[PDB]
Amino acid sequence: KPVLYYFNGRGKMESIRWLLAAAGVEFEEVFLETREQYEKLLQSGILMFQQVPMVEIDGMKLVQTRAILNYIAGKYNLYGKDLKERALIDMYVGGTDDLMGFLLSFPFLSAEDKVKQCAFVVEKATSRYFPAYEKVLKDHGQDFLVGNRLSWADIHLLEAILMVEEKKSDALSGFPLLQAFKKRISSIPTIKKFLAPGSKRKPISDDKYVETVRRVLRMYYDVKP
Amino acid sequence: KPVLYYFNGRGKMESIRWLLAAAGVEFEEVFLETREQYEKLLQSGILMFQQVPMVEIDGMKLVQTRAILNYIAGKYNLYGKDLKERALIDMYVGGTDDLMGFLLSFPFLSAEDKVKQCAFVVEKATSRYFPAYEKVLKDHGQDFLVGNRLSWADIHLLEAILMVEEKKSDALSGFPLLQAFKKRISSIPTIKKFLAPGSKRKPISDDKYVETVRRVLRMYYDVKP
Ligand SMILES: CCCCCCSC[C@H](NC(=O)CC[C@H]([NH3+])C(=O)O)C(=O)NCC(=O)O
Ligand SMILES: CCCCCCSC[C@H](NC(=O)CC[C@H]([NH3+])C(=O)O)C(=O)NCC(=O)O
Ligand SMILES: [Zn+2]
Hints:
homodimer; alpha+beta; Glutaredoxin; 55% helix
């Protein structure tokens, strides 16, 4: 039912794909590949702020990545049981959202800047974020980040870890609880399926992605790290 | 009584001040002035990600601006009645959060870039955001953005409007419904008191704010537009 409008790549839409898959929800995708269809999309006025991601779900044309994620999380009970749990989930998700946010521009960076940005991301992961989540798991010694059950915070943390490992395969060295976490969460049926071949999970963005985005939107021609 | 940890200025903490005040909740503030004072915080490790804003409320050390705001909004019934309305509130707040986000670095910009950034913001406001919100009110024939009843989205839009008017006094020129909206929200007792002199509302950030930030966090020395 849900239709995700975006480019054929990760970008800001990937986390939405992750959350939907984790909830075992099947979705379709509409890839923007030409300046024509985009302008036609702006014509219809279905993009409230003239921006994508855009997701058609339950009779709504939702824009704003966080709005879309929040709704999917709440609808499929992955947002906790009370306001207090939701506050923890939002706090944890805020950390990983910042971490993955540093890699959003990577594809558009020059071969030179990519090296600097890459070192930056790894530094942030191992010195700021990983320690923080490692401490949370140890503080309560539970299998999940909150409510002793799977939540959006778990899914978002698993995605961030895999993205960091794509840059440094041994990034989890020195964080045994997170390493166990990674294994456990990956084993969950819906997630295991998304990680398996033939899923709608997108691969690391390449030059074809960078070009398509630059043509359709006519922006990000000079992304600075 | 919730305690807010940040610098003596707007920054990312201002919206939190707005939300608490609108809900009619008094709060205390703790301004960071010395680098050694910040290191003390890190020492106790109260800042999960070594960052501020940080708010102590209901026995929690919440970090991540959006996490804090989502909590305050839901706790004081300013987050809609159901998931659908919440989705609408998040989508709207996403827009004004982006708009105000463009003015976050302004204080650290140069006289050269400030004139550039100022034109960029007013441009985005009048051609992308204000038209969107103006349309919501007209097409739905409502006096409030969601559920035709005060919600966080209304409070976040009023703040954004006032920030744009500080840069261009006649920015709302051409948006009659937003001008009526501005008067309607400002007349709400709690908000009216926050706009009156003597409140906890912070002024536009000045050089003294910038110097302090750079002195405490030791960064943001080269902030490009
Ligand atoms: C650094 C390059 C990587 C950026 C990837 C592009 S995402 C596409 C971009 N959308 C946004 O920036 C949306 C921001 C919005 N706050 C959200 O979170 O959804 C867009 O449509 N932009 C068109 C526009 O702004 O007009
Ligand atoms: C462009 C200049 C504008 C000034 C913004 C400063 S807010 C202070 C800054 N905090 C953040 O960036 C927090 C981001 C976090 N995602 C949130 O929204 O709360 C910090 O603690 N930084 C210290 C650090 O990152 O270690
Ligand atoms: Zn190694």
